[PDB]
Amino acid sequence: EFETIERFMDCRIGRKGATGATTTIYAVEADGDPNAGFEKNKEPGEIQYLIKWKGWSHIHNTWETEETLKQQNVRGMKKLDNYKKKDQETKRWLKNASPEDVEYYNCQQELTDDLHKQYQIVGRIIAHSNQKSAAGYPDYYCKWQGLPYSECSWEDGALISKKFQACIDEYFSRK
């Protein structure tokens, strides 16, 4: 306490209030998207940013506005200015570019976009906890798709099982 910006993964406009815990993949699979079905064409959302947090896997990323950040008193604020300055610099250098340049930028960015989504999925469970929740779930050491083992981390047993039961059944299956 308190939390720290590690990396800005993305940028969007969405429903005002569609920020925070309710905005994780797990929260969203369980309960639905607070940004439900947001047409740029409900009252303009706000500029919202997808945040990757210090000491927390990508599974736990949240969408946050300049204001929630300031509100939640997080550290790494400097990084919101660079992200913006940098975002502006890109746009300016791409106002007039071939359609080729613009084409390249959209593929070469769909690539990453998709890449980053993989960090949120477990490609292998490698260890579990000797202690268990009251519900009787152990925690799992997870190997995430797309990232080195130095990025493995311990995920809540219930959290995982909701989506990666297969990885779980498979880990125990290899005994």
């Binding site: 815990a21 736990h60 809540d156």
Partner: peptide, 6 residues
């Protein structure tokens, strides 16, 4: 342990 499961 530790989720955001508000």
């Amino acid at each position: 342990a530790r989720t955001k499961q508000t």
